[PDB]
Amino acid sequence: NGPEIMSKLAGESESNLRKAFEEAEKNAPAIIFIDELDAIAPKREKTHGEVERRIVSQLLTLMDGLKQRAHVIVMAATNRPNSIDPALRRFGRFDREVDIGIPDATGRLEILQIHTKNMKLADDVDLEQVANETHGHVGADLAALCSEAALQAIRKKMDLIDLEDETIDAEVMNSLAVTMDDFRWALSQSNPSAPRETVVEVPQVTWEDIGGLEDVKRELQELVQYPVEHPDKFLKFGMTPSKGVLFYGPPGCGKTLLAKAIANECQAN
Amino acid sequence: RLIVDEAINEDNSVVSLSQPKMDELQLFRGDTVLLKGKKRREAVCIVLSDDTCSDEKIRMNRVVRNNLRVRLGDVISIQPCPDVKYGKRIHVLPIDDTVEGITGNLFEVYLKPYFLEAYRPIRKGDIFLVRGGMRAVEFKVVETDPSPYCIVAPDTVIHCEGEPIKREDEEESLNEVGYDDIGGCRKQLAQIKEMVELPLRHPALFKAIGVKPPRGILLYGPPGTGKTLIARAVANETGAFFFLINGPEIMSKLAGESESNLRKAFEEAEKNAPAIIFIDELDAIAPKREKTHGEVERRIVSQLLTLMDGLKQRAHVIVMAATNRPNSIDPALRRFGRFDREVDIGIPDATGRLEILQIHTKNMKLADDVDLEQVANETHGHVGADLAALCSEAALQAIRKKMDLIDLEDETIDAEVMNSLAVTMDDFRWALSQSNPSAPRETVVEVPQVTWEDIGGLEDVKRELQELVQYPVEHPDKFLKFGMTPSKGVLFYGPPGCGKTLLAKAIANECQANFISIKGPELLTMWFGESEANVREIFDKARQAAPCVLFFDELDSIDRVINQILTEMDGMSTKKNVFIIGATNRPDIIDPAILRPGRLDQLIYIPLPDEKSRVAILKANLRKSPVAKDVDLEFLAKMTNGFSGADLTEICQRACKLAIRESIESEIIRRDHFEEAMRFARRSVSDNDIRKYEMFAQTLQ
Amino acid sequence: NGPEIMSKLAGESESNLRKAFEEAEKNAPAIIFIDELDAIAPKREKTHGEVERRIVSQLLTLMDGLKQRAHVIVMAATNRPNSIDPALRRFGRFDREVDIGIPDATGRLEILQIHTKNMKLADDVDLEQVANETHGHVGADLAALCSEAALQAIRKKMDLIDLEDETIDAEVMNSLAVTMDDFRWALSQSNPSAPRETVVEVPQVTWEDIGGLEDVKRELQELVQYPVEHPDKFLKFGMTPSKGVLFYGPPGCGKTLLAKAIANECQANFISIKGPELLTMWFGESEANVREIFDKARQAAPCVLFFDELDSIAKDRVINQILTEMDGMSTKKNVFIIGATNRPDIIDPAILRPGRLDQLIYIPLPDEKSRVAILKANLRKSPVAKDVDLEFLAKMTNGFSGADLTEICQRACKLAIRESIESEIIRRDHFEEAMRFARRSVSDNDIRKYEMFAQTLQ
Numbered sequence A: 001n002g003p004e005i006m007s008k009l010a011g012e013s014e015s016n017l018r019k020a021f022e023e024a025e026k027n028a029p030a031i032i033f034i035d036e037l038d039a040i041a042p043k044r045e046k047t048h049g050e051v052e053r054r055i056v057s058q059l060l061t062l063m064d065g066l067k068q069r070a071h072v073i074v075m076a077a078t079n080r081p082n083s084i085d086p087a088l089r090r091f092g093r094f095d096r097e098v099d100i101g102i103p104d105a106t107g108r109l110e111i112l113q114i115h116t117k118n119m120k121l122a123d124d125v126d127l128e129q130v131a132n133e134t135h136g137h138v139g140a141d142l143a144a145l146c147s148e149a150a151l152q153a154i155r156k157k158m159d160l161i162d163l164e165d166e167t168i169d170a171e172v173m174n175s176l177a178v179t180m181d182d183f184r185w186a187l188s189q190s191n192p193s194a195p196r197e198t199v200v201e202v203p204q205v206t207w208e209d210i211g212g213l214e215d216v217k218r219e220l221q222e223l224v225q226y227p228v229e230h231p232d233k234f235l236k237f238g239m240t241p242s243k244g245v246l247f248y249g250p251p252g253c254g255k256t257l258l259a260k261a262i263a264n265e266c267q268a269n
Numbered sequence B: 001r002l003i004v005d006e007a008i009n010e011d012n013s014v015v016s017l018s019q020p021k022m023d024e025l026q027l028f029r030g031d032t033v034l035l036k037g038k039k040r041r042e043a044v045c046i047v048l049s050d051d052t053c054s055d056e057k058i059r060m061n062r063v064v065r066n067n068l069r070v071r072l073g074d075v076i077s078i079q080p081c082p083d084v085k086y087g088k089r090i091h092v093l094p095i096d097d098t099v100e101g102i103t104g105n106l107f108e109v110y111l112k113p114y115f116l117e118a119y120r121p122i123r124k125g126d127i128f129l130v131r132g133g134m135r136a137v138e139f140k141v142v143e144t145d146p147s148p149y150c151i152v153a154p155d156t157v158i159h160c161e162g163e164p165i166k167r168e169d170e171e172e173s174l175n176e177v178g179y180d181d182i183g184g185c186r187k188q189l190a191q192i193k194e195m196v197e198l199p200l201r202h203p204a205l206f207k208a209i210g211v212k213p214p215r216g217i218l219l220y221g222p223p224g225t226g227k228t229l230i231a232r233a234v235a236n237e238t239g240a241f242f243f244l245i246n247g248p249e250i251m252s253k254l255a256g257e258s259e260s261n262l263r264k265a266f267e268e269a270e271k272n273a274p275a276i277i278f279i280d281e282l283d284a285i286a287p288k289r290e291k292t293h294g295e296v297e298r299r300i301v302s303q304l305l306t307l308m309d310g311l312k313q314r315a316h317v318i319v320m321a322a323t324n325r326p327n328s329i330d331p332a333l334r335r336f337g338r339f340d341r342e343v344d345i346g347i348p349d350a351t352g353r354l355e356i357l358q359i360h361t362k363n364m365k366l367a368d369d370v371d372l373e374q375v376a377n378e379t380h381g382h383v384g385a386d387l388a389a390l391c392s393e394a395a396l397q398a399i400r401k402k403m404d405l406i407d408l409e410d411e412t413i414d415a416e417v418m419n420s421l422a423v424t425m426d427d428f429r430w431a432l433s434q435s436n437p438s439a440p441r442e443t444v445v446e447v448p449q450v451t452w453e454d455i456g457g458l459e460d461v462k463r464e465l466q467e468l469v470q471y472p473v474e475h476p477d478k479f480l481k482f483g484m485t486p487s488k489g490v491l492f493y494g495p496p497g498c499g500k501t502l503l504a505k506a507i508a509n510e511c512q513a514n515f516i517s518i519k520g521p522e523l524l525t526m527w528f529g530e531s532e533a534n535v536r537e538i539f540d541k542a543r544q545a546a547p548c549v550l551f552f553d554e555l556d557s558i559d560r561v562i563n564q565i566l567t568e569m570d571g572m573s574t575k576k577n578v579f580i581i582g583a584t585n586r587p588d589i590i591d592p593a594i595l596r597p598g599r600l601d602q603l604i605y606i607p608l609p610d611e612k613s614r615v616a617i618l619k620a621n622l623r624k625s626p627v628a629k630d631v632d633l634e635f636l637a638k639m640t641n642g643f644s645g646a647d648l649t650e651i652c653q654r655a656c657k658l659a660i661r662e663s664i665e666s667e668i669i670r671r672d673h674f675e676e677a678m679r680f681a682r683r684s685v686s687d688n689d690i691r692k693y694e695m696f697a698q699t700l701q
Numbered sequence C: 001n002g003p004e005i006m007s008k009l010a011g012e013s014e015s016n017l018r019k020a021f022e023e024a025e026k027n028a029p030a031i032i033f034i035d036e037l038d039a040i041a042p043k044r045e046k047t048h049g050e051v052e053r054r055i056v057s058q059l060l061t062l063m064d065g066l067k068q069r070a071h072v073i074v075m076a077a078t079n080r081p082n083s084i085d086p087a088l089r090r091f092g093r094f095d096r097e098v099d100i101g102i103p104d105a106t107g108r109l110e111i112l113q114i115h116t117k118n119m120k121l122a123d124d125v126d127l128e129q130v131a132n133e134t135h136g137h138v139g140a141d142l143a144a145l146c147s148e149a150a151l152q153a154i155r156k157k158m159d160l161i162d163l164e165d166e167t168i169d170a171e172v173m174n175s176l177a178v179t180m181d182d183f184r185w186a187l188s189q190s191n192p193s194a195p196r197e198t199v200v201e202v203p204q205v206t207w208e209d210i211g212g213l214e215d216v217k218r219e220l221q222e223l224v225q226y227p228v229e230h231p232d233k234f235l236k237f238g239m240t241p242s243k244g245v246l247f248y249g250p251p252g253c254g255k256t257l258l259a260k261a262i263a264n265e266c267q268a269n270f271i272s273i274k275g276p277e278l279l280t281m282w283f284g285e286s287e288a289n290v291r292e293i294f295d296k297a298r299q300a301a302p303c304v305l306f307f308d309e310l311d312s313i314a315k316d317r318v319i320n321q322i323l324t325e326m327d328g329m330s331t332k333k334n335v336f337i338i339g340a341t342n343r344p345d346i347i348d349p350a351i352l353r354p355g356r357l358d359q360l361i362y363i364p365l366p367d368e369k370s371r372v373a374i375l376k377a378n379l380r381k382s383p384v385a386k387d388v389d390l391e392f393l394a395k396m397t398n399g400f401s402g403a404d405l406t407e408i409c410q411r412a413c414k415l416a417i418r419e420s421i422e423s424e425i426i427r428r429d430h431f432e433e434a435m436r437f438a439r440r441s442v443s444d445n446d447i448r449k450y451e452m453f454a455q456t457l458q
């Protein structure tokens, strides 16, 4: 992690990087992880110093300690990639990029399912309506939500009964279960700290997924899913597909939902 | 008697002999001859008909260059070889450093495709290799049962030893890249090849001639486009010493000993003369701005700025440089007595990325299903570094398609089943489906491919332009014979989408100048971002793309940019064979200060195309596929009153989309769609502008 | 050198500097050379530390370090005179500030003869074919091109002839030469890295090169000669001459040419500033640059400043700053500043008062006989015979300026070279081609709108 690397004095922070690289280069294969790269590697004059430069310089070049016979591999994690140095992002030093992003509500269903394997939920809850209103929240916030839901459930018991002693009472908490208004009470705290950014999502509206009204259908469905099975047929009869289409007319007609149904039809984001 | 040049044709034991060189030592096409060599080498090679090279300078492989063990590029005689003999019983052994863990008897499965039907003339103890599946093998002959110069015969057999021989430092390694291994820009690599080759030829020349060496070569440009390996490649091509100087390793150490590290590296560089040294990422070294907080980074730009001049100049060593942006470097290094003439290789074009594919096809062991010109199609704006990453991802998906599901491994690692495995077409599509647009999308510098035959119509304006772009650069002496100078500015105006952007490729493809496509919106983003230093830098590295042409369109959007193009056109490049296109659609709203003589002044109105011109443009639009000629093209141009080339392309595009619509709506061609496109509701043509453009023409009168 | 100060750490760099200066003082008389002093002494927000203040410390004392007993003398040399602090510009420390500037064409040619006495140009070499067009290139660049022209010569030998050995044969060096194609290939190399700073040069063209407005010629000749030929007769009357005259009318009439002729009369330096580069400096807020170019014009004595396109800034901060810092009335320096424009109507009225640019004189279209004399001088530009007369070419071109006739005769010359090299393996036809094309793209309706502002002065 970045802050214990940058916490030490100059000189031995480089030796901290040395042990952090080749403590496990002899343990091939191994994984290293230098998370929150905004805190350790920006490109700013805000960092009015040189120890951060001496940290990130030779880090980006002694991640090349794989001499085509080692098996060192690095996962990189940060908040926003624009604040990362681009010469750090230069190929060879760092090649390619992917985003985990924000989970969707459909994915929130199974993160709420697989986080609740231990808490022994009761049959009164349904878990579907729980994942709907929490759009724009990270899965760590949902883990927090069910965590203090369990803490609220064990809070109204186990001390009001005065079952507190030095030994735990496993049978009481095993008989205990979380319930629906516990999730309502968990919703009643400051959960939206994961902010409202842009969202990627797999759509579900399908009332008019096949195109528009009249021949808008027959141009829209070809334009949005005939390339994904037939790419070469367009070049075989001559030229590229279209680049973009215009939507214009009276506002609020469901055209925004129509594009959602278009993306739902082609099974794309 | 004969000099070595670089050859595209990679088949070894092949001499690319010129036809006047045939009768001097009695050479024939199918036959092979002996060569001279340092420390008494013999090279044997069959004749390739290559007359466009010199008689003495003959294009050869880098593998026969490595076979010669010459430094490189030196003069060697040819002995004729009338004592050719095929023979048998040639023991062939590999080398250990090439063996990356390839299991067992690789002898027959690599030798037999290499040896069948080639009849390749092979000396004793020579070096040669194959490539395929990210590694294949080098073979060296231990002994020959005939003469020490020998020829592969079909009855030649080997002992399948299974034990490679210990390597030597005398041989130049084959992972050490060469001139043909880099395929970014051939003429620019020629510029960096004979830029500084005279120390690479002879250090005693500059120890004996008072001409100063070209002191310091800098390759700015796209991020990491083989530039470190370009310096490594020319270091291998001179055969001199090289050691890499990492940019961030200067900032690795603390203050004081990082100076000692860099200075002692520079001193042992001088100790190891003849040599070339290279520093990457000088923007990490010298970003001399207000962003240079502290003082030890000023200490870092010091002693480099000392040892530029602290070169003894009796010491003949050469420094090499690369970065991303030239203006990001500290500006005290631009002048003379500092870093010398600099260049950008830039983003490679379609042919250059095709060549980086063919140098990457060699070590793939690929099947004939793939052609990779389709990969060369949509690779616009994509660095060949990312293309090599894409080829690596293709190989990884190929070894993820099979052999991780065939499961022929517990600890055994069979590379032969990996070579029988091959990358395929949809594997290349899937490799294209990963993060290829990580390369930045800037304007492209490319030698054009669209010819003058692809545009028909306005032959008088075309004759004027064919005069303008060729007769100054054919006859400048006839221009200045009568006391006159060639012009540089031309005017393009009229209705948009007529094909004026389309002819900009052809006007540079005909005279074989370079093309740069300068467009208004990214100049507007540079103007809003106040990065006009980037605008004069793209102008200047267009000027060092000589011979070139400057196509700029939609100039009515500008207000600083017009003032700075008037500044930079004052220092025009008359003898660099450049020309400037001024193009717009609304010429009236621009200021009339630009139309003065000495500036962009040669006024030609560009009209909307005529009916035969529309037939030619429609024909060139339908040349991308076999289109049936059952529909007459003049009737397609009959109803077109003001339908420009953009209108023609969208009409034929609508015909193509409706044709493929009815092609794939069937349950699991030309005439009906052309009649539908001619007889649809829309006729969207701006027709009012013809009267005011003729009003402008009558204003010129 | 400045990087040798920045070579080692602080303190011991100072000691090496001092010890170098007592051994310079022990080697009296002596010269001490320092360059990149802007890198030594900047006064901006690049003060990211204090060691730079430590290194200008004791240097500023050692300019006072001699007590008229040490014979030594400084030599400071950094390109930007504005990027230094005024602490280094203090009197008694650095008094004699002098420029160098880009060489003139008469200087570029002798640069080419003093850098050819070693590598020995061949018989086809004249060096004026290179010296004419090399504006924007410095003598370091010219030495670079002569060096790598010698390199392109040296690729022709020792490998194509294969007389190579360890010791270089100097006899084949003596037989070696350099060609026209070698020199234009050298010119085709990446020369233009020398910047686009404005040029200072003595002009060699005068009123045998232009014809037109001979009374204005004689009046400006009097105004630039008799103030500097007889300043004592102005002392006899006690008042100074005014050194500002306004030019207005149709553009492209040769306002640059008359400025070169009037600078050739005084054999003065020709400096020609114009609109777009000072707008580029103004958009970056760099009025110190235009103050600097006017100041180095003031030590370009004698000089004549040419300046045009007032109307781009007449409608603005730029005229305000240059009107404030044009008031350094150094009329005794043999300097001269002029104002050219196309439209004198939209100029600010803070110019017509005295003490500045004063004399408003109209610059009309050239006369037909004047353009006959212009083309008569321009037979070097474009030779004309008398099978068709020059005045016969001026029968219907009364509303054409000098740039207009220049571009149409250049079009006729382009047609001449075209139809000369049309034949697959000289004057009258192309002049009739010029006469038979009916182009009239010149604003001829501005005559009365110029005349109303002329008769406003009346």
Ligand SMILES: Nc1ncnc2c1ncn2[C@@H]1O[C@H](COP(=O)(O)OP(=O)(O)O)[C@@H](O)[C@H]1O
Pocket: A091, A092, A093, B181, B182, B183, B184, B185, B223, B224, B225, B226, B227, B228, B229, B230, B348, B356, B383, B384, B385, B386, B388
């Ligand atoms: N035009 C090209 N020719 C050959 N190789 C190239 C080219 N462009 C990019 N590459 C490849 O891209 C990689 C990155 O280039 P470079 O910056 O030299 O590498 P590094 O930073 O690892 O030293 C290199 O391994 C090189 O092989």
